[PDB]
């Protein structure tokens, strides 16, 4: 309703996006009503119903459609929380191929774009989950939280798949028990990779702090040494100075 | 583990504590007072050496001006009375006696 629905440029662009999604996802092949369908700018009510049914079944698969879909469209949109629902009049829903299709056309686009984003919103989640399932010491923190999240979602994955078996019919015999052991090996393995990696980080750090430490204790040893030699040298010089005058005097005080 | 300092901080603390300042300072006050002692010994004895360099350079400019020159490099005394290119050379050997030496010298000076 807050959209330039009557603007011909807007209509054109949105038509393009509609066509692009329906064609990309094999709309016409999956349903032959709009076989090789291209830009309905003068739609047919039948086809409209086709498109709506397909898109919604993609949003909500399993929805039983009655034999007349025009009856369910308003309720479907009310359940979906269609934001523009107020701009649509129930009366105008029966036959939309007339004047106000400019509104209903817009609606269709809103669905497509919505669909575009839904398949995105969900896919990113799917992808995200995949990332969490395989998810210098100071710099990388929280890693333990990532391994505990891992094991939460790895135990989750394990549960869901093992159950898919448990309820499944054909497969449950050989593939079940082995599957467990296999999933179990990955765990101890990868974290063992961690353990050893950090043992090596530990020891090579030992050569870091040890190279530096050794060098340091060496220069310390140096200071101690030359400091000692310095004091000693001074003290020798002093001692000599004190003695010499003593002797000089020793021989000169005979006035006989 | 070794080739390393077991406790370096203790080593350096140690190194500071046995570095004895007041001892060396006291040795330098010592050396100053030594010098001052000498300076007074030299000095009161530089009037005794202005009286032994006047007693000696009066009896040395005088003895020397008598023509008697100690040559102790060669263990001998030179007598130059005439300064004509001829001198008398008297060895300081313990052999000759003191009376004969004296008599001889005064004979040479009387020529």
């Amino acid at each position, epitope marked *: 309703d807050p959209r330039p629905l009557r603007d011909k440029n807007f209509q054109s662009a949105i038509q393009e996006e509609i066509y692009d999604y329906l064609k990309k996802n094999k709309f016409d092949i999956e349903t032959n009503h709009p076989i090789s369908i291209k830009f309905l700018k003068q739609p047919t009510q039948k086809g409209f119903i086709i498109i709506f049914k397909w898109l919604y079944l993609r949003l909500d698969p399993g929805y039983g459609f009655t034999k007349s879909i025009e009856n369910e469209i308003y309720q479907i949109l009310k359940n979906l929380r269609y934001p523009f629902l107020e701009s649509i009049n129930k009366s105008q829903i029966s036959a939309v191929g007339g004047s106000n299709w400019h509104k209903f056309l817009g609606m269709l686009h809103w669905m497509v774009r919505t669909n575009i984003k839904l398949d995105m919103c969900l896919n990113k989640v799917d992808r995200s989950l995949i990332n969490q399932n395989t998810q210098t010491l100071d710099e990388q923190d929280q890693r333990q939280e990532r391994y505990e999240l891992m094991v939460e979602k790895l135990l989750i994955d394990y549960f869901t798949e093992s159950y898919k078996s448990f309820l499944k019919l054909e497969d449950n015999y050989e593939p079940s028990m082995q599957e467990l052991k296999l999933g179990f090996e990955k765990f101890v393995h990868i974290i063992n990779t961690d353990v050893t990696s950090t043992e090596l980080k530990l020891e090579e750090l030992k050569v870091d702090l040890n190279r530096k430490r050794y060098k340091l204790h060496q220069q310390v040893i140096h200071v101690i*040494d*030359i400091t*000692s*030699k310095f*004091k*000693i040298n001074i003290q020798s010089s002093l001692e000599n100075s004190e003695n010499e005058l003593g002797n000089v005097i020793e021989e000169l005080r005979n006035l006989e | 583990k070794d080739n390393l300092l077991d406790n370096p901080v203790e080593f350096l603390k140690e190194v*500071r504590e046995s*570095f004895d300042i007041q001892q060396d300072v006291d040795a330098m006050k010592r050396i100053r007072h030594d010098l001052d002692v000498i300076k007074e010994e030299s000095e009161a004895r530089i009037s005794k050496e202005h009286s032994k360099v006047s007693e000696s350079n009066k009896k040395l400019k005088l003895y020397r001006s008598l023509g008697v020159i100690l040559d102790l490099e060669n263990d001998q005394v030179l007598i130059n009375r005439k300064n004509d290119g001829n001198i008398d050379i008297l060895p300081l050997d313990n052999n000759l006696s003191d009376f004969y030496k004296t008599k001889y010298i005064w004979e040479r000076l009387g020529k």
Partner: nanobody
Amino acid sequence: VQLVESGGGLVHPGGSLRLSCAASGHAVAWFRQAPGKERDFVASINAVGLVRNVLGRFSISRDFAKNEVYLQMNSLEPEDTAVYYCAARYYYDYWGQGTQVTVSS
């Protein structure tokens, strides 16, 4: 720790001598034992140069970079004849095997 002594032997009187002791493996010092007598403390030097002694004919020093202590004797006397033992402590925990010093009258 190993204490390696060197520099002893038969020496004429009035001469000079220097004994060395190298530690391998705080204070380092010298004792001595004259023939038929008890061991006697000669003197010590701490890692820093605190010297505790014996008269001016004997002088102890150290090179810390070499971990070595030195005992210098001048104008040697017949009473100096003895077995001179190097010793080292963590403050006695370590001893050398001893180094003969014989002053020939």
